[PDB]
Design a protein around this ligand. Structure first.
Ligand code: M7U
Ligand code: M7U
Ligand code: K
Ligand code: K
Ligand code: NA
Lengths: 414, 415
């Protein structure tokens, strides 16, 4: 059976990363911030919070709003996720040295949780007020959930496929998994991949709040997101979007690109357990991590580091601890970045994949914020307090989505 | 030499069961008979919303048998429409397959859709605007999320080897079958339910596509309106559908005694990077999606006896696809455009047309393309028309293209 280690798949490397977060618009600054213990989570000051008296009054808006970079035409003729895709795809391409690739070997794979949904409600209101001829001629292309990937594919010139996998909170990781598949199956030599997501707004907060999934520690915003802590009380929104450039090691060498890490293998499984709760036993989630190892050609004993999905729900973190045990990965050093950056839904697995890469590049794991009282059910080596330095070689990034979706990505130091 | 189905580098994958609901029939076998008899599912729309809004489009095909006549009280309150359609088709498919006892850890679901449970977005929005955040359902997130129908089916049927939802607008239903074939041939699953679901004809969808000037407005003769490849075409017509198939390795089928209907041999996915909604005129990357499906199957273009065209009956789309079929070397295939009779079901349609391609191979017959009356010289294809065309069809390609520049081609063969 082919694996990356045995040469049955070609070697695939990560050659550039870009992200915008609640800490910074610059991924390198976000990273320095994380290592210094910074949080992106603050009191929400939006008028919508008081207008509705929302139960949730905390979150991390982007440090640098996407629309501060957008012309007036884009603000009207693109949905928000498309604008985010255009901004991040252009940034990534510049970071990569604007390479001249063969468009016919270049794919784009970008996940998102929903798509241009503000344009659904806009079109509905316009039609209700004015009739069907008031709906924009650009409404379909702004709404369709493949819209952001399609904008990026047209902008950068990708003709080897433009794919949008949707798996709710695992979408951003799933996108990188399918990009890796598209390269190792021989359909592309280079891909832009990752995830984008909309901003914090009143209706998204109402819907998730009514699920009772969210922290309401509004008193102390930076202390609210507590993955694996005994006193955790649910997740916190933190806006983001993230893309990375991956390509065959061959392709990278031929253009002189310096790899940041290796993308070794990807596992996708599902729970068949519940529409929003993850299976308590962690078994299928663990098998996603095992599958990524099998395709990489690694054993769980090789794994140095897990970047946890770690949302800070009581049931979600308990299930993930079980998953990491099922996969034999519970001796590894664990980081839960949502402690600092909060949860960006369809973007978050992509953001956390970029963080995994930077851990491997720099030999360091940031502290998991708010990790103060260990939970006996969890029993994981959670990095906390100070950043932890080490010669990390191999890491798994976990992401799980409502609907029972498990995605694990195996990364290696270059 | 690289793996193909023909050289055994990929395992053999067979289609073992199919289910669809359409404007002609809730029964796929009765849909197929109807198509062969020249039936159309397109009629005048009778909905109050047409006259409320004075819509410029007044034709389309609603399902013959509405999904919600089969839904219980709780289903109507806990699922979006595409999830209800997914639960209904998933149970029908499983029964049609003999309710097999498969290993859940080797069983995947891959179901595409164009949008998701979007009616629950506008419902939630209205509820909150009237009554505040506490009026939003605690089920709103799971009903809205576009992976929702695939997740309902995966939970219903017990699939633990992955549940995926590729979105590529009007190619989503074919792209789902492509990713299901990949999940099997990469070794992640031995059996998969896959296809596509989509919402019903409603005013707001009509309004949005008719503002693109994309739709036929031949209201006085509804069965004559959808005219793919015809000189006098004037845009697409909505026809509701949902469709799923069961695929599995040949070994898995044989061990449980399943009778295959056809083989699924390979899949190509490319993109145009040309325009956000118009397909590239030159058909080059769409042709490459067909060629790639042939490479992975281990076929040559001369092997392809039949192409089931995406054929939406837009002036631009049909011309690009004819070019693409020529680029792929497949323009001596017999061509069927089923949207002529069933209309366009957006995220479902590639899956429905994949089911029809399987049936053409199983039965050795292509239905007539309806309304094909005046050949267009920029098209130059062998379009089946008038009576069905019979033959021992050995291999076929199904095409589907989506706004955003997405091209998907699926190669199938006779079992
Ligand atoms: C990290 C947060 C993640 C949230 C993810 C939630 C899903 C994201 C959906 C995209 C949101 C885009 C919002 C951008 C528009 C914007 O900014 O416009 C505001 C005005 O508000 C609006 O238009 C509200 C728009 C509401 C749109 C419908 C949202 C429906 C949400 C569902 C009921 C709940 C979430 C479903 C998630 C399912 C997928 C993942 C499991 C300023 O406008 P102005 O007056 O200053 O010009
Ligand atoms: C073959 C047609 C394909 C259409 C494809 C459109 C794609 C989206 C389909 C989703 C539609 C689901 C509707 C089912 C619910 C239902 O039936 O609710 C009616 C009442 O109306 C409504 O709630 C209408 C609410 C509409 C929801 C928003 C739709 C937004 C459409 C966009 C502006 C335009 C299309 C975007 C497509 C992008 C993806 C593909 C390129 C029963 O009324 P009652 O029982 O309450 O009396
Ligand atoms: K993670
Ligand atoms: K077709
Ligand atoms: Na006849």
């Amino acid at each position: 059976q082919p694996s990356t280690a045995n040469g049955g798949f070609p070697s695939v490397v990560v050659t550039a990363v870009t992200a915008t977060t609640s800490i910074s618009p610059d991924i390198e600054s976000t990273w320095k911030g994380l290592l210094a213990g910074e949080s992106g989570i603050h009191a929400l000051e939006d008028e919508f919070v008081t207008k509705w008296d929302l139960a949730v009054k905390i979150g991390g808006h982007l440090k640098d709003p996407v629309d501060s970079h957008m012309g007036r035409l884009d603000m009207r003729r693109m949905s928000y996720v498309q604008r985010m895709g255009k901004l991040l795809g252009g940034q990534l391409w510049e970071s990569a040295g604007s390479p001249e690739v063969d468009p016919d070997r270049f794919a784009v794979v970008v996940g998102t949780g929903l798509g241009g949904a503000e344009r659904i409600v806009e079109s509905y209101d316009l039609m209700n007020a004015g009739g069907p001829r008031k709906v924009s001629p650009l409404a379909v292309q702004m709404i369709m959930p493949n819209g952001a990937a399609a904008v990026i594919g047209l902008q950068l010139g990708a003709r080897a496929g433009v794919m949008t996998p949707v798996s709710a909170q695992s979408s951003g990781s799933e996108a990188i998994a399918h990009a890796w598949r598209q390269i190792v199956m021989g359909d592309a030599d280079v891909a832009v991949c990752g995830g984008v997501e909309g901003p914090i707004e009143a209706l998204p907060i109402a819907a998730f709040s009514m699920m009772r999934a969210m922290s309401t520690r509004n008193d102390e915003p930076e202390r609210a997101s507590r993955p694996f802590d005994k006193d955790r009380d649910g997740f916190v929104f933190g806006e983001a979007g993230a893309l990375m450039l991956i390509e065959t090691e061959e392709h990278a060498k031929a253009r002189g690109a310096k790899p940041l890490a290796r993308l070794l293998g990807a596992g996708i499984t599902s729970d068949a357990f519940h529409m929003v709760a993850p299976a308590a036993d962690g078994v299928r989630a663990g098998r996603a991590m095992t599958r990524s190892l099998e395709l990489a050609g690694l054993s769980p004993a090789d794994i140095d580091h897990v970047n946890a999905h770690g949302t800070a729900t009581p049931i979600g973190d308990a299930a993930e601890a079980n998953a990491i045990r099922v996969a034999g990965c519970d001796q590894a050093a664990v980081y839960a970045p949502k402690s600092a950056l909060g949860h960006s839904i369809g973007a978050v697995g992509a953001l956390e994949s970029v963080l995994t890469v930077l851990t491997l590049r720099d030999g360091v794991i940031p502290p998991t914020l708010n990790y103060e009282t260990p939970d006996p059910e969890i029993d994981l080596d959670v990095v906390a307090g100070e950043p932890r330095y080490g010669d990390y070689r191999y890491a798994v990034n976990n992401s799980f989505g409502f609907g029972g979706h498990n995605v694990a990505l195996a990364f290696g130091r270059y």
